[PDB]
């Protein structure tokens, strides 16, 4: 789950 | 070549099942593993769990606090209790949750050894009420009345405690 | 080298069995996976399911709304209930169905945790009646009398609600 | 010619096992039975139970309040949750306990029907918090924080609530 | 010399378990039995049941309407589908209930034979919606929307329909 | 490297077991698969089956009518009821059978969902009696008396209906 | 790389177990397979079996008579009924047996479908008595009294019928 | 007319099996029973048991101290931790043992309820160390080191504590 | 009215099965029973047993030595270990055996409690080697080499030890 | 009031099942029983048995030779090995058999104790070959070759040995 | 790459388990296999088996006598009946045994088909007594009294028959 | 390519489960294995175990003291009895523990062989009390009262004995 | 690529489990295997076993004495009653043991075939008492009293017999 | 449990 | 099953 | 088992 | 277990 976790 | 294995690559772990000693050993190993490749890459840990026991939960928390990299946490769906104590034990600014996720705080079930060890259980579950109090920002005497009852708290209202600090 | 695996290639997922936490984790992963290869390629999701539970169904819906690509949906055969709420949670103009397929809408079975969490179940199943009302175009006070009864609706008549918008 | 049968004679009943619909019917019958022989003889009810469910517990309580004789209650050993609600539902001056007996108050487990009936469970367990408040003498807003947590209370300290009023 | 047997004496029957063909035959017999001793003594029938099937429920109702004595009914605790249709089929002024009892009306589960008999099931469950309409006093077009949904109704509010007419 | 796998190569599928949702999904996938390699190569489908259910059989029939290639059918040995209906749903001139094979036509067993859905079963099994009437060449009012009885028909006599049109 | 697999290479099949629909499909496939490599190479079929059923046995016999190559047969050990009807269905001059092997002829067990199909069983087991009469070179009315009894004839005495024509 | 039943006559009870709630209720009843016939006749209690739990053992001890008659105790064979605490709880001068019998003192196994009740277990097993100290004549600080270890003590050496006071 | 029951009458007991605590209690009771009717009538005890354990065997021996009547013993068939120690523990002149019966002497199996109690087992099985030495007439240092090995001894040769003193 | 019980009356026993220690004890008792009523009435023993073991068979034979009355024997149907030795151990002129009954002589199965006792088994099965030689009238060296092989002997030919001496 | 597989290489087979049709087919194949590589290399066969049946044992013996190479045999450990008939069926001068090995000769257990085939069993077990007589060198009338009894013969004494001719 | 396997690489072993002979053999092998690659590289051993038995624990301790490299030890989580004894048997300055870990010392459960070997158990558990006394630095007469009781000791207080000498 | 497999490399075998015919065949093969690579390299054999049977143990001993290389033996942990013997059957100067290992000598359990073979068991267990007497150096008449009793002997005291001759 | 329940 | 299906 | 089987 | 077995 990126941007931002990764 | 499994899908979870590929998620172990690029630094993710999926605690999804439950907690006991069988899965504890297999998670402690992966944590120590990924630390060896790079000592600064942010590892993450996804949670979706219905419970957990006391003795093993305080093995992952220690390992999490020892490896030089920093861990991040997310709540997918349910956030049982002992496992979800891990969610409140990541970093000070990298705890997330999805906006339909439920989390509760309650002292776990079962015993320590998994005869009955009375003097030791009663000490272990005092630590939880003290570590949770330094990671949220509350007083102690309120946690002692929320670690005795049962009611699920939503993701938008969990923020006012400090278990989570940014909701995506 | 399995056949489903080859269908994971070129961007298809097959929810075919049922929904619980075991399959939920394995679908959330594939969704996040395929997003990483390309951020604009249309992923799809085929449905044929006899049921589902409440807590896990509201994990796939959130993930579906977060990844930058857009999802499409099709109804092969049966469209149980919780799973079929996913069918109505696609992309305004890419919801399909075959012309013998049955779909029903009904509030699911079971509880949240999967004691009984009363105040939370009753809140969760209010969201369903509200999200379904913004994706079909109906009033709320009609959905509240179609999310309490049981009758299968065919594919040609489902169109008049908005669950589907093009039948191939 | 069993021993329990002889205890049914001279007006005693032994709820000792657990509560479900199988034993509920067999206790309601004995209560109605003994009423027919004499309409003023004091019947009694001994309790030693590990639990109980919600729907059947509110069948014995009603029957207890209808037959013209008066019931007395004693706590042998354990006093579970729902059942221990029967102990606080006898007569205003004939509730006893032995001086090593444990009693706890907690809202029971399970559902009503034994899909999930949400609006009805949540109403039923409000009645308990209201009937218990007229038989002890406390306010309501204290019972609402003792019918949500778990801790066994001894026989000497239970007296200060009103569940018991004479310890032999 | 069992306790239920003594309740068969002085004219009571205890349907307490469930309904299928095994118990149906054993209840039809007792009804015909007690009629033979006296042709005017009021027999009664106590109900506490979690369900029932369609074919056997319409055997007790017919027998109830044939024997010259008159039957009375009471609701102890739960009143499910099907069986509780029997509660609304006694006498015009001898239907009772306790003031914590739940009753619901819903079309039963399962089939007729207990291949699938489609044309016959659909006819049988039309009779229920028509017999219930002559014993309560309502229109038909309201029963047709209360014999399709699920929600338990309390004893004080059941009175406004006509299922019960005096609450003790 | 299995033998069936090699038969998947050069365009054959072996429905041999039975029909339910587990095998349905795995056959729909292979059909869509082989279409992707070439859009004009004749795919085939061998049948030897003891039965089948209603909801899944009307998933393969739709998929068969959608892919641009044309399907051929053969009857090895037994031809149950719902399965057999697929045999009469291939091409107008590429339906075969071996000269000892048995085929019967009968409305299937079981329900749709696999409570009872009465209004929908009764509609589904009307479609069968109407689709079979456009692929054989008979009137409707004869199929309605051969889709209610049970008798196996041989391969030489099945030809006079139209289920098969060339026997090798 | 199994041993049977290597025997599939250079054109041998080992029916050794029993006959039902599970093994029938897997043998029909191998027969069609080996035909595709070369259209004139002599394939063989080794038999050692304790039984077999009626519907599947008349699937291998048809396939055997269709592929352009010619089949040979051998009897290793036992030659139950039915499975051994295949032994008498190879070539006119390539049927063998070892000189301790037992073979019997008897009409098989079980039914056709594997309700009871009376008119069809009775027809199927008339074909056997007629096909066996053209491959042994005998008059019928004797086969009709050897396909009703039970008595294992040897390998040296089986020759006088025509089931075998050269003993190695 | 069983042999144990005849031993219930003339005032003997045989705890021989184990202790749990099932047998506890059945012993409390017999004690109350025999008291009703005569209020001064010496009842006895024979012990031969491999264990016992905490909550039920402190039900028989209370009942023993309430009925006006006086109880006597004997040790046949084994004397296990909990139950054998009953042996040291009879009368001051009517505790016996056979001269090959073993008795040990150890805090029992298991929990109170039979989550984990920590604060209550730890209190219950303090009472044992205090009641045993008033019936033997020892200090408290020695019992606290003999209620933590495990070693069987013979009948001739048990006398020097006070568990027994006359050996027959 | 069983046959063994009639043998309990006129003073016989049949240990025939095995020894554990379940049968021990039931034999101790019968011994005490028959003593109450008459204090001088010779009771007997027939033995045919394949084994026995240590703790219970030293309960019957004590009871045998306490009741004022005198016991007699016979060996029907097998005389395992342990129990057959009972055979050598009757009266000095009333021990018999049939002239095909086998008897062996060997230290029993299993433990005392039935953790491991080492210091107590090793003491118990020293008593056996000492009690057997006063009832036969041998030295101790020979019994210590016949209570360590295994070999069945016949009835005619057992006499030379003293286990038996008259063979009928 | 069973039928076998009535056959115990007027002096018959039915060994019909098998032999082990469970039935041995129950037959020895009946033999001793019936002797007590009358000391001269001829008791009988019917045999129909498939086997037996060594240690228990030499308990009934001894008891048979001790009671002052005389026993008679009959062979209904099968006469196993061990049992069939009892048939040849009755009286010298009261051994019968029905004229379709089979009897064989063979040394039994299993061991003595029922480690392995070698020196004792080998002695026990020498006695059988010696007792059978004094009740038939043959030499020993022929029995030693008929107590090693297996072949059933009919009733008309068994007479020439001496196992039977009058066939009814 | 298993160890037995490597023993199949360089020409060894290990019959070690038992004999039935499942293992028979798998041994006949290996024998035919190794013949194809080289037609003169000495194959061997190691035996250690507890039994075997009649119909399959006379399949390996025939195959052994047909392949042009010559077989050798060894007895590792046990040589039950039947499977050990193969040991006496190798070569005239290549039969071995280890000097602690046991071999017995006895007619096997079970039937031919594995109703009862009487006339055929009795013929099959006559062949064994005739083939064994041409490979040892004895008369027939001695084998007919050693193929009816049971006694294990050692390796040093088996030589005097001819089953073995050189002991290593 | 498993994760534990990779931990075997670079010299780690994970005793995590329990101890019995099955895992003992597999650990002794790995220890001997890693010694062969390099004779001076520090191997380690991680412990997290709920128990262990006596005979196998004194196999790993001996092997640990024989290989020329030096072993290090860590306590992850639980340190039952017996397993923990290995933790106190590593090096004099390389024993660690995490600061939430529990360790207890208690003599193990079960027997030696895993009849009862009394004289040998009692000797084995004397060695433990003597080896532990040379690795901590305490007297013997204190260990003899801490190897008889049960109480978990924390990681900060275990240091004062000598089981651990540096806490990370 | 397993760990035991790598230990098979460089000439080690691990008998660790138990002995029966299943493992016997698999060990005889490995012994013959490793002999083929090199005819002078010292093979070894590690032992840790709880038992064994008679017939298979005298297969490994023979094979051990035949292959031209020389075997060495070690005792890891337990040395059962039959395993032990192999340990005393290696070389005259290459038998070892660890200094906590237990070894006992006792005649094994069970029979030869694994009816009862009396004359052969009794001969086999005479060989053991004679082979053990030539490998230790004792007289025969002492082994005959140590192969009849049961007591474990330590490693330091086993040396005085000759089972071991150097302790590492 | 009398005196006084019964 | 060719000629002609395939 | 060679010399001489093989 | 070397030096010296192997």
Q: Using an 8 Å Cβ cutoff, are I105 and I160 in contact?
A: no
Residue B160's Cα: distance from chain center in Å? 18
Q: What angle do CA C36, C42, C46 make, to 5 degrees?
A: 105
C107 interfacial to chain D (CB closer than 8 Å) = yes
Nearest to H114 by CA among L69, C63, F126, D48: D48
C87 is written with which tokens? Answer: 């069918």
Q: Using an 8 Å Cβ cutoff, are E103 and E155 in contact?
A: yes
What is the spatial distance between Cα D70 and Cα D45, in angstroms, rounded to a whole number? 11
Residue G95 DSSP code: B
Strands E14-15, M102-103: parallel, antiparallel or unpaired by DSSP? Answer: unpaired
Q: Which residues of B touch D148 (CB under 8 A)?
A: 149-151
3-state percent helix, strand, coil for chain J, nearest multiple of 5: 40, 15, 50
What is the enclosing helix (H) or strand (E) of B44?
strand B43-49
F137 is written with which tokens? Answer: 């060449």
What angle in degrees, to the nearest 10, is found between the helix axes of D21-37 and D54-64? 10
3-state percent helix, strand, coil for chain L, nearest multiple of 5: 40, 15, 50
Technique employed here was cryo-EM
Domain that residue B74 falls in: 3-167
K89 is written with which tokens? Answer: 């069926």
Q: Is L137 exposed, middle or buried (0-12, 13-18, 19+ CB in 10 A)?
A: exposed
What is the spatial distance between Cα D130 and Cα I31, in angstroms, rounded to a whole number? 60
- Which member of G44, G53, G101, G106 is catalytic? G106
What is the spatial distance between Cα G87 and Cα G45, in angstroms, rounded to a whole number? 9
Of the candidates C107, C118, C125, the beta carbon closest to that of D122 is on: C118
Q: Could you identify the residue written with the tokens 């590990």? A: D50
Q: Is L32 helix (H, G, I), strand (E, B) or coil?
A: helix
What is the spatial distance between Cα I130 and Cα I143, in angstroms, rounded to a whole number? 9
Nearest to D131 by CA among D69, D82, D93, D70: D82
What angle in degrees, to the nearest 10, is found between the helix axes of B118-136 and B54-64? 40
Q: What angle do CA H146, H76, H26 make, to 5 degrees?
A: 95
Q: Using an 8 Å Cβ cutoff, are B15 and B27 in contact?
A: yes
Chain F partners (3+ C-beta pairs within 8 A): C, E, G, O
φ/ψ of residue F49, rounded to 5: -150, 145
Q: How far is CA B74 from CA A5, B35, B92, B163, C64, in A?
A: 8, 20, 13, 11, 16
φ/ψ of residue H76, rounded to 5: -90, 110
What is the enclosing helix (H) or strand (E) of I4?
helix I3-8
Give me the residues paired with residue F95 across strands: F73
Q: Is the dihedral of CA B150, B156, B161, B164 positive or negative?
A: positive
Nearest to M138 by CA among M109, M108, M158, M166: M158
Q: Is F69 helix (H, G, I), strand (E, B) or coil?
A: coil
H132 is written with which tokens? Answer: 């045993």
Sequence-distant (≥ 6) Cβ neighbours of residue H100 within 8 angstroms: H155, I58, I59, I61, I62, I127
D143 interfacial to chain E (CB closer than 8 Å) = no
M106 is catalytic: yes
Q: Could you identify the residue written with the tokens 């303090």? A: H126
Breaks in chain I, after residue numbers (C to N greater than 2.5 Å) = 114
Q: What is the DSSP string of E136-167?
A: H---HHHHTTTSSS---B-HHHHTTTTS-S--
Cβ separation of H111 and B116 shorter than 8 Å?
Answer: yes
Cβ separation of K74 and P1 shorter than 8 Å?
Answer: yes
Q: Which residues of D touch N1 (CB under 8 A)?
A: 74, 96, 168
CB burial string L29-63: b at 16+ within 10 A, e below: bbbbebbeeeeeeebbbbbbbbbbbbbbbbbbbbb
Q: Using an 8 Å Cβ cutoff, are C34 and C43 in contact?
A: yes
Q: Is C45 helix (H, G, I), strand (E, B) or coil?
A: strand
Which of K72, K98, K101 to mutate to test binding with chain P, by most P CBs within 10 Å of its CB?
K72
What is the spatial distance between Cα G56 and Cα G63, in angstroms, rounded to a whole number? 11
Q: How far is E11 from chain D (nearest CA, A)?
A: 13
Strands G71-79, G102-103: parallel, antiparallel or unpaired by DSSP? Answer: parallel
φ/ψ of residue F82, rounded to 5: -60, -40
Q: What is the DSSP string of I15-71?
A: E-S--SHHHHHHHHHHHHHHHHH-SSS-EEEEEEES---HHHHHHHHHHHTTSSS-E
Catalytically active residues of K are 81, 106
What is the rounded end-to-end Cα distance, in angstroms, of chain E?
31
Longest dimension (CA), chain C: 50
Give me the residues paired with residue I74 across strands: I46
Compute and round to an integer the Cα radius of gyration of chain N: 3
Where in I68-158 does DSSP place strands (E)?
71-79, 102-103
Q: Is E2 exposed, middle or buried (0-12, 13-18, 19+ CB in 10 A)?
A: exposed
Q: Is H77 helix (H, G, I), strand (E, B) or coil?
A: strand
Q: Which residues of K touch M113 (CB under 8 A)?
A: 50, 78, 80
Q: Using an 8 Å Cβ cutoff, are E154 and D117 in contact?
A: no
Domain CATH code at residue H162: 3.90.226.10
Q: How far is CA D87 from CA D54, F159, H60, M96, M105, in A?
A: 15, 80, 20, 73, 67
What angle in degrees, to the nearest 10, is found between the helix axes of I54-64 and I118-136? 40
Helical H segments across chain M, by residue range: 3-8, 21-37, 54-64, 83-87, 118-136, 140-143, 155-158
For the beta sheet containing J14-15, the strands, ordered from the edge strand earlier in sequence to the opposite edge, are J14-15, J43-49, J71-79, J102-103
- Which member of I17, I81, I101, I154 is catalytic? I81
Nearest to M59 by CA among D130, H122, J129, K16: K16
Q: Which residues of D touch E6 (CB under 8 A)?
A: 33
Q: Using an 8 Å Cβ cutoff, are E72 and E94 in contact?
A: yes
Q: Is B74 helix (H, G, I), strand (E, B) or coil?
A: strand
3-state percent helix, strand, coil for chain D, nearest multiple of 5: 40, 15, 50
Sequence-distant (≥ 6) Cβ neighbours of residue C74 within 8 angstroms: C44, C45, C46, C47, C96, C97, C98
D157 interfacial to chain H (CB closer than 8 Å) = no
What is the spatial distance between Cα D80 and Cα D49, in angstroms, rounded to a whole number? 6
Residue M49 DSSP code: E
Residue of P nearest to K72 (CA): P5
Q: How far is CA G70 from CA E92, G37, G41, G63, in A?
A: 86, 14, 8, 11
Helical H segments across chain F, by residue range: 3-8, 21-37, 54-64, 82-87, 118-136, 140-143, 155-158
Residue F146 DSSP code: T
Nearest to F114 by CA among C15, C83, C50: C50
Residue of C nearest to D112 (CA): C116
What is the enclosing helix (H) or strand (E) of B126?
helix B118-136
Q: Which residues of C touch F59 (CB under 8 A)?
A: 48, 76-77, 98, 100
What is the spatial distance between Cα C50 and Cα K23, in angstroms, rounded to a whole number? 45
Give me the residues paired with residue H43 across strands: H71
Q: What angle do CA I54, I55, I58 make, to 5 degrees?
A: 90
What is the spatial distance between Cα J11 and Cα J45, in angstroms, rounded to a whole number? 9
Q: What angle do CA B34, B38, B43 make, to 5 degrees?
A: 50
F112 interfacial to chain C (CB closer than 8 Å) = yes
Structural domains counted in chain J: 1
Q: Is B63 helix (H, G, I), strand (E, B) or coil?
A: helix
Q: Could you identify the residue written with the tokens 């013993």? A: I73
Nearest to L52 by CA among L79, L31, L81, L15: L81
Q: What angle do CA F34, F35, F40 make, to 5 degrees?
A: 115
Q: Is J37 helix (H, G, I), strand (E, B) or coil?
A: helix
Residue F41's Cα: distance from chain center in Å? 20
Q: Using an 8 Å Cβ cutoff, are C46 and C14 in contact?
A: yes
Compute and round to an integer the Cα radius of gyration of chain C: 16
Q: Using an 8 Å Cβ cutoff, are J52 and J69 in contact?
A: no
What is the spatial distance between Cα L166 and Cα L72, in angstroms, rounded to a whole number? 12
What is the spatial distance between Cα G64 and Cα G87, in angstroms, rounded to a whole number? 11
Breaks in chain C, after residue numbers (C to N greater than 2.5 Å) = 114
Give me the residues paired with residue M72 across strands: M44
Phi-psi region of H6 (alpha: psi -120 to 50; beta: other; left: phi over 0): alpha
What is the spatial distance between Cα G134 and Cα G38, in angstroms, rounded to a whole number? 29
Resolution in A: 3.4
Of the candidates J109, J115, J118, the beta carbon closest to that of M115 is on: J109
Q: Is the dihedral of CA J3, J7, J8, J12 positive or negative?
A: negative
3-state percent helix, strand, coil for chain M, nearest multiple of 5: 40, 15, 50
Q: Using an 8 Å Cβ cutoff, are D113 and D54 in contact?
A: no
What is the spatial distance between Cα I115 and Cα L124, in angstroms, rounded to a whole number? 15
Cis peptide before F20 (omega within 30 of 0): no
Nearest to D47 by CA among N1, C121, K146: N1
What is the spatial distance between Cα B74 and Cα B97, in angstroms, rounded to a whole number? 5
Q: Is the dihedral of CA F128, F131, F135, F137 positive or negative?
A: positive
Give me the residues paired with residue E14 across strands: E46
> If DSSP states are collapsed to H, E and C, what string results for chain E?
CCHHHHHHCCCCCEECCCCCHHHHHHHHHHHHHHHHHCCCCCEEEEEEECCCCHHHHHHHHHHHCCCCCCEEEEEEEEECCCHHHHHCCCCCCCECCCCCCEECCCCCCCCCCCCCCHHHHHHHHHHHHHHHHHHHCCCHHHHCCCCCCCCCECHHHHCCCCCCCCCC
What is the spatial distance between Cα G63 and Cα G31, in angstroms, rounded to a whole number? 8
Q: Using an 8 Å Cβ cutoff, are C31 and C13 in contact?
A: yes
Q: Is C17 exposed, middle or buried (0-12, 13-18, 19+ CB in 10 A)?
A: middle
Q: Could you identify the residue written with the tokens 């009934």? A: J60
Nearest to F104 by CA among F88, F91, F92, F89: F88
L21 is written with which tokens? Answer: 């002979």
D74 is written with which tokens? Answer: 């004693």
What is the spatial distance between Cα K134 and Cα K139, in angstroms, rounded to a whole number? 9
Compute and round to an integer the Cα radius of gyration of chain B: 16
K39 is written with which tokens? Answer: 């037609």
Q: Is H71 exposed, middle or buried (0-12, 13-18, 19+ CB in 10 A)?
A: buried
What is the enclosing helix (H) or strand (E) of M44?
strand M43-49
Give me the residues paired with residue C75 across strands: C47
Nearest to I119 by CA among H102, M151, H152: H152
C28 is written with which tokens? Answer: 């959330």
Q: Using an 8 Å Cβ cutoff, are B96 and B168 in contact?
A: yes
Nearest to M154 by CA among M47, M92, M45, M77: M77
Strands K102-103, E43-49: parallel, antiparallel or unpaired by DSSP? Answer: unpaired
Nearest to B47 by CA among B67, B27, B70, B69: B27
């Amino acid at each position: 789950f990126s941007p931002a976790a990764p | 070549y499994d899908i979870y294995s590929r998620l172990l690559k690029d630094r993710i772990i999926m605690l999804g099942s439950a907690i006991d000693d069988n899965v504890a050993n297999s998670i402690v190993s992966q944590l120590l593993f990924l630390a060896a490749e790079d000592p600064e890459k942010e590892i993450s840990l996804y949670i979706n769990s219905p419970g957990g026991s006391i003795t093993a939960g305080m093995a992952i928390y220690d390992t999490m606090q020892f490896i030089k990299p920093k861990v991040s946490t997310i709540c997918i769906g349910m956030a049982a209790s002992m496992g979800a104590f891990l969610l409140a034990a990541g970093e000070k600014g990298k705890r997330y949750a999805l906006p339909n996720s439920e989390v509760m705080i309650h002292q776990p079930l079962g015993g320590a050894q998994g005869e009955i060890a009375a003097k030791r259980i009663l000490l272990l579950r005092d630590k939880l009420n003290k570590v949770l109090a330094e990671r949220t920002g509350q007083p102690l005497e309120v946690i002692e009345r929320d670690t005795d009852r049962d009611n699920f708290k939503s993701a938008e209202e969990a923020l006012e405690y400090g278990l989570i600090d940014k909701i995506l």
